[model samples]
Target: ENLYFQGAMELIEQHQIFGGSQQVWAHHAQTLQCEMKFAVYLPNNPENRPLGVIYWLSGLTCTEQNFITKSGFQRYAAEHQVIVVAPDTSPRGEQVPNDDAYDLGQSAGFYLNATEQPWAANYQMYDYILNELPRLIEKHFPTNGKRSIMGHSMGGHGALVLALRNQERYQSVSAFSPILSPSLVPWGEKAFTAYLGKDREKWQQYDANSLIQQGYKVQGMRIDQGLEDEFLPTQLRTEDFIETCRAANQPVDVRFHKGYDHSYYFIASFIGEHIAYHAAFLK
Candidate 1:
């Protein structure tokens, strides 16, 4: 389920992977208004060196377990000496709002703050990612405040939106098939309207394409795309985003790999590179 957690963190799950500790902790999120859990991997800091953190946002319909369990990122995190945290895509609980469609409710957070209620109360994923979670991590963990963000698919879109909007906070950014533009193009699609409500102007700030059009940019921001992904032409819209980024005089390092779909295989293949890329900037 899409989620976040509570306390200094109620350490509920723990294991050793790649000479490091991978833990899942529960906390009552003020933004999500429910108990949630996030997975974090902390490498052994043999020298007590200050560590950088990498926030990994998962794709749609994925829980905190999706990236941690499936992506095989811990070895890379240990190799690169960075802490990796993967939070659930959307808040889930009986008290939180729900809908029959999988894309509209629990896993369809879109990583943006919702203005419409009762969605507004618990669907504050943007705030949760931007504010609440980071503060929680830094307060309790040994981090240097130097951080980066990366994700896959819908979560890939989240890494871009967050890094673009708050460039100072992140040292580097990368993603896999990040929706260059959402159905939010002048902002459309009924699902986005329901999540954010129907305000064309409001949608602009949440969109990566819209933000770039307004001249927002980041350097060496890498994005990887699979030509075989079904969502690429329609939903991912890489061509349009690349055109717009070029038009805006923004620099983007996008790698196109043949035959790779939007599956975890694509992410697992390149997450090490992404982690290493951010590690370079962290210094």
Candidate 2:
């Protein structure tokens, strides 16, 4: 385990799951310009072959620990023999600036590169998630070249936009209650205004529905939204993205669960299927 990554990475905890190990690590993040932390789950098998990776992005007010601790994804990862990586939602420290509101700063990174003041320097999560972090994982882990991404809420938006913009990078995509059209919603509008300026065009580049409506293509993408989710009509317009996918002739499996809500319980209930969905494509 020590030989896989640079000495800078500190393994703080580990848990046994399905004959494998779920581990947490802390490291200095060059992309974030601060110390960053992430969690990884690796299956312990005699084969010792590199496994395909599934990156899980968590939503607002979440840290790397949320999915690793709450989503109950480790059993599925170990069973399928794939690695799972969960990164922190945002950069943090005294040096890093923040907002008075939770929706505007810190945990709500929105997973886009910032072009405006204060945030521009550290809020380059778009690059970190799509580029730098992956590079680090590849260099340090025994992961198969195949990769897929999925997330919840704000993270759901991150996974969708990242995969759509870089379609060739991931084998599959999925989400749960993502902010599909950030530009059309208040959460996205405020973050975009502060991080990307008032230019609606720039905002579109990060909007998953907009990208698909404008001709972005995705294959084998799945999304599960809880109809009872509190943010359904307001913060998360799941239908808008589905309609856009329909109009573009892009195939997506956006399922709606009747009694589920926008919580970890919803994610926990269907995480197995989502993992299976990505494994089918990755393998």
Candidate 3:
């Protein structure tokens, strides 16, 4: 019995636009019963066979559209014959609860399953993004299950931690302005303490620094940091993770881009390079 067998799907709102060779679809569902939305782009391959996928996660206060419309990745995806999937940062609806700040609710999910009060109920994005999301995609899309991940800012943090934690699932990983050691930074600390609760030990699970320190490198990974990022000291503290990688003898190519603030402009500038890096590994 094939528990993961898939069949053809005829969904509405499915259109073609990003690239002539790419087919686009909008999937709507309730992950954990929360209003969820995600977008997928499939490259036109005559083989009609499963291809590799790149999952992109957006940063704070962003929806699935941010990457679909801003990242400029579909053309590269079409060229490489790679599928791309982008999901909303967090679950949302009028009945759903939220945090007062932008970094905690309605957008920032930290890419981890919430385990604390008021948050654990609807904040299962960790499972949604890493577990259920893939299961759902594979059920409908022709994917090889050889996937890579990349993101910006908070989503960048998600990419790093996810790859480090689940290297078996992702062939390669990269990030732009990622929150490396969220445990040591204010942004990560606040969200972890709020959604995950105190007792710093528990927070260690989501810290890329901790994972790298323990030993989390197959060969190498690419990480790009914008020097002019306003939230560097307060949120990302990348050097700690870099040093951990060094200690672990992991080849992490960390590029510091000067004059580039923590914005989409920074991501759009180098997303091609990022995609190229992942394409080399996925293909």
Candidate 4:
């Protein structure tokens, strides 16, 4: 066993960016049955400032580096005096089970605990993100007990499902190019079958459209979509969820940018606004 002043977490690295510290920490995740790495941007603290935390999730084939290196969120986060945590997409190791395809295992955790064989031993991104990670963040950071969440692509799907199901735990929720109705989409179906054991009923718990149909609602939410995103027509069915939200009278702000694509550049262009939106609620 190793020892760090911050308890169980080991600081891998840290850098100064926009009056904040960009860092990575490694810890043994009991839920996932592996050592996990997560990135954090802790703005300069002086005299007990406002301690709001915003959790960012990335899409398939992503690690903790995606949002921190790509989204340019440090400026806004430091300005607003908030902490941002971005965890790696899934568990990893030679012993950990994996699939030959990119959409089912490894980088594509789908943010749910796997129930099927060869996967249930270690895949638990849902419990890891929703429970363990936040608890770890809170213990080491001076957070004011306010929390918000946002994500991109598959990360967006996980963010929506978690926030909607546990509205009491998060103050606000938002997403950029998220896979909204996974139960009705190709990528969603494949991952669901492999990890969730082919039960359509259990699948509803992770699908935004089905969650809405079951009458789960958060106070308000925002979604930003790029019209040029290649996955718009097939994998990312955000419109279906928007329609269901409308039918249920759930308020949502869905913005479709004219020429934007499902890339970090699109997210970089608007991440400040998303951070600000959550900043208001966190304040």
Highest-lDDT candidate: 4
| lDDT for each residue of candidate 3 in 144-250, tens digit (9 for 90 to 100) | 87899888888888888888888788888889999888888888889999888888888877888888777776556788888999888778878877788888898
Best-to-worst order by lDDT is: 4, 2, 1, 3
Q: Clashing pairs in model 4?
A: none
lDDT of 4 by residue, 179-276 (tens): 99998899999999888977799899999888988999999999999999999999997778888999999899999999999999999999999999
Model 4 TM-score is: 0.97
State candidate 3's TM-score: 0.90
Compared with the true structure, what per-residue lDDT tens digits does model 2 show for residues 1-283? 4434457787777788788888888888787788788898888867768889999998988999889988989889877888899998988888887998989889888999998989987888888899978887777788888899999999999999999999889999999889999999999999999999988999989999899988998876888999999899999988887788888998998899999999999999999999988988766
Best by TM-score, which number?
4
Note the clash tally of each candidate.
8, 0, 0, 0
* Candidate 1 ranges beyond 4 A from true positions: 1-7, 184-188
Worst 10 residues of 2 by lDDT: 1-10
After superposition, the stretches of candidate 3 with alpha carbons farther than 4 Å from their true spots are 1-15, 18-31
RMSD of 1: 3.1
Q: List the residue pairs that clash in candidate 3.
A: none
TM-score of each: 0.94, 0.96, 0.90, 0.97
lDDT of each: 0.85, 0.88, 0.79, 0.91
lDDT tens readout by residue for model 1, 105-136:
88878899888877888998999999999999
